[model samples]
Target: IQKAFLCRRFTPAIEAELRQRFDLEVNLEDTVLTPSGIASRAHGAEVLFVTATEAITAEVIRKLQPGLKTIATLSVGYDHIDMAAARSLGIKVLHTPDVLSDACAEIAMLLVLNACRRGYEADRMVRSGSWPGWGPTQLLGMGLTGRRLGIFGMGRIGRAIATRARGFGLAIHYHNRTRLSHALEEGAIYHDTLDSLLGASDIFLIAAPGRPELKGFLDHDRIAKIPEGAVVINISRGDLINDDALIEALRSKHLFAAGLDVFANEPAIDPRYRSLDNIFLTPHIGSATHETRDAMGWLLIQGIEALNQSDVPDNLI
Candidate 1:
């Protein structure tokens, strides 16, 4: 009997669909597997539907001991997976994309607002009753209006974010591999170089994909170009930011606040980032909304069913 295992909990819809589709065992427990092989620990499992909480490698994939057949990821980005090995061994890979674009865009904006307004610090003061009575200058934070907001990659999620940001009266700017259409570029400026964008933006939002090649692309040199007191937000993968460099920049006030939903070494973050009051952190929940998650879960099920039929859909890749 081939068993399918999941490291995190999924919606009942996804659970039911998986239950009907295969012999599934879902584990809700979260543990950081240091040097130990994650797939080997699964013992008899044939398929694993997991998240970005851990890295899945070819060695780990081979260690599954002959039953492993599929690796279906809940999130769109599969930087954690060893794709070349999976394809070489004929083991299928599945991912959910497009479905969570709006939800992610919404959170990107939320982070922008949160970072611009000192979300964590203000919340701490209010909840701890340290408000000390509100005065005119008590909780001063920058507003989004007319500020330059630069998005790293303007794909589906990025475009949605741009739409929402317009309501906040932001002057949009983006830098992608290829420029967008003229209409989409109507109210927004496009910068080719990351340095140019950083120099121009008052608020920078990163929505780029997570790939090994793109990892730590936002290093100190790029970040240093941002003007002083400029806020930033990252609702996408954390690997884009150099953890050590970023922490230093934040602590030194070289850049303003950063609202992060993702981290480089997730679950176990860089210790240096913990002390910074200027950053707003979350447990990587860009697609946490109920409606969007359900759609995502359904898409994952669709990928599973397609793979079972030996059909490799384009979206799965």
Candidate 2:
């Protein structure tokens, strides 16, 4: 059996399956590993299975080039890996993509509902025993009925979110690099420019790709275009939005509330976000469901098997 090093611990079933297939070395503690630590621990492994937590930089990839043949990540995003370095060293890269789209879209909608309805504050009041009983004016929040939802990207996950939002009476509007076919678009309004989309959004949800050019894409200037009191939600990568600008907007009440699952430097996200009560935050649990994770693990295994047979799988990145 080939040697495999799992960068983090997984579920019991995945752990057993990995062990049965390969000479697996796992991070039993389930802690994230540093680049140097990953370099040292995964030195001689033929396969390195990692998550977005591991920074597989050029230096780390160079250190493991002698033995590491395949690099597989559990999540859909592989921005943490230096793809150029991997390609130069002939390292096969694989990721789990479509399997988690529904899970992620679900979280995006959850954020929208939570942020719009002020779910966080309501839950805190009940849990902290500060509930003053129900009054007609108690904890008033924005209603979703007949609101406009603008999606930044109209890909599979974006379309999925639009489908769900329709049931809640939100009119869908989207801005993408290109328009989808009418069949896929399902009557959702399409904007030629992002500014137009932003202007029309009562609830702005980001589902775009994670790219260097898009870092801090949502700045103060763009936020200004959004009508006051509109909700903002991001289920995509965190760095896409400017942290300072968002915090200031919430502070100034330029925006109603924000919902975020991913953060710029996650786990160590902007401290300012915690001080504010207008935002709903999650610890990147977009694909945390049992079904999605199991599918991802099995897909990872299948990807490795295909690689062993010298076949390029559909999920290769």
Candidate 3:
């Protein structure tokens, strides 16, 4: 069996499979490891397994050379891995992709439902035993029917979200770098510019992949353009939306409510958010389902298998 080192703990099912195939060493404590820590601990490992939280740099990859043949992540994103360094070292980098579309879409709509329906407010009210009884207008919220759902990026996840939104009678609209075919669009209205989409959106969903240039995309100016009393959702990353701007909008009631599954510095989020009841928060649980996670782990295993035989797999970065 090849020596493999897992930077963090994974699902028991995946770990079992790894044990059967490799001489696996896992971080039982599950604490975040630095690049240097990974290098020293994973010393002679032929394969290095990591999650998005662990940033693997060139130095780490170089130090593990002549042995670290494969680097795999349990996520669809490889932003934390230095692709250039891996390529230079001829070390194959693998990431889980495509399998996450449905799972991620589920969370996107989950956020949508919670945001538009004041789900957080209602749940907290009942949980805290503050329910004075539900009156006709006790906690009024916007209905999804006939509302324009503007998607910022319409790829697999966005299309998946649109498909789910249709069941709730939401009207789909979107803005992308290139317009999609009618077959793929499925009647979603296309806007040439982001501003145009903003003006029409009753709900704005940030489904676009995060890029450096798009940091702080949802600022006060763009939020103001989203029409009054609308809702917002983000299933992507935290840095895309300006937290201060979003908070103020929710505070002033310019926005009905907002839902977030991602944040700037996760686990340690903005303290101000906990004080507000107008927003719904999740700890970056997108693509976090039993089936999806298993598929992700399996994909990495298969990709590593392919690499061992001198074959390139689709998951290769």
Candidate 4:
């Protein structure tokens, strides 16, 4: 008997690693092909593996019926899962963290790069047959060299992103809950307040996690501190941003442009964001590399295996 059920198709490398690591059966085929298919596969599963894109609601949890032991998510955030219900049901919910730091850090840089270079506008210009020739004011964009970069949250992934930013000649400044050591930050400046970082940076890269204290930390007041014609990018969760304030800011040109990888309400893009050319959007693919995905899958397997052996990891909430 296998130890888990695969709700979606994973890379062959992930399957091989899972097979080698655990004496468990895994459904390599995409089990979430349809509602009926999911229902069929979800039954008889002791542990279910899922991703941030997949919904693991109480209803999906109930489908596992009597044998459900844990839900191991391949992404770092458990915001997609109904954690309170899972906790009550005695079901362990786990997420992979360290496996995704570098992958996500790379994406953070991508957003920063695309935002600064007007990559979205270039893509649109080419697609709509409007690439008539280059002129001096034709899609002029921000320059990264010699600009101050203010990062929120100086955690592992945040530091990784900072390391990459240094290559572009950015002076790294960050604000964390607590002061980090000189060695951990590599001589990065620490901001005493979030407002201070916002005021100083030409480019702001937000990497704060989901928490009550950080909700709407980047609203109108804080964003207004940023000088006009500056750029903002968010690869972190969207709840940290104030949607109403940001939409108005972009509409009024308080901020030059933005690159967003997550949303407050995903799968349903805000209508206001559609008409704006000053923004670039992605569907939350922060850790979407083949190698990283496999590593995340193995982390999921390890979480399930821990539960199978009656031990819960520290990240379980």
Candidate 3 — number of clashing residue pairs? Answer: 0
lDDT of 3 at 135: 95
Give the clash count for model 2.
0
Query: Per-residue CA lDDT of candidate 1, range 223-312, in tens?
Result: 888888888788877888888778878888888888889988787888777678888887888889888877877777777667768787
Clashes of each: 0, 0, 0, 1
Compared with the true structure, all predictions reach lDDT values of 0.81, 0.92, 0.91, 0.80
TM per candidate: 0.84, 0.93, 0.96, 0.85
lDDT of 3 by residue, 27-135 (tens): 9999999989999999999999999989799899999988998899988888898899998888888998899889899999989999988889889989999899869
lDDT of 3 at 93: 88
Tens digits of per-residue lDDT for model 4, 16-97 = 7666654445556554444345546678777677776677777777777778777778777787777877887888888878
Kindly indicate the candidate among 1 and 2 with the higher TM-score: 2
After superposition, which runs of candidate 2 have C-alpha atoms over 4 Å from their true positions? Answer: 62-66
List the candidate 4 regions with Cα displacement exceeding 4 Å: 16-41, 53-65, 79-93, 305-317
Better of 3 and 4 by TM-score: 3
Q: Write down the lDDT that model 2 would get.
A: 0.92
Worst 10 residues of 2 by lDDT: 205-214
Q: Worst 10-residue stretch by lDDT in candidate 3?
A: 262-271
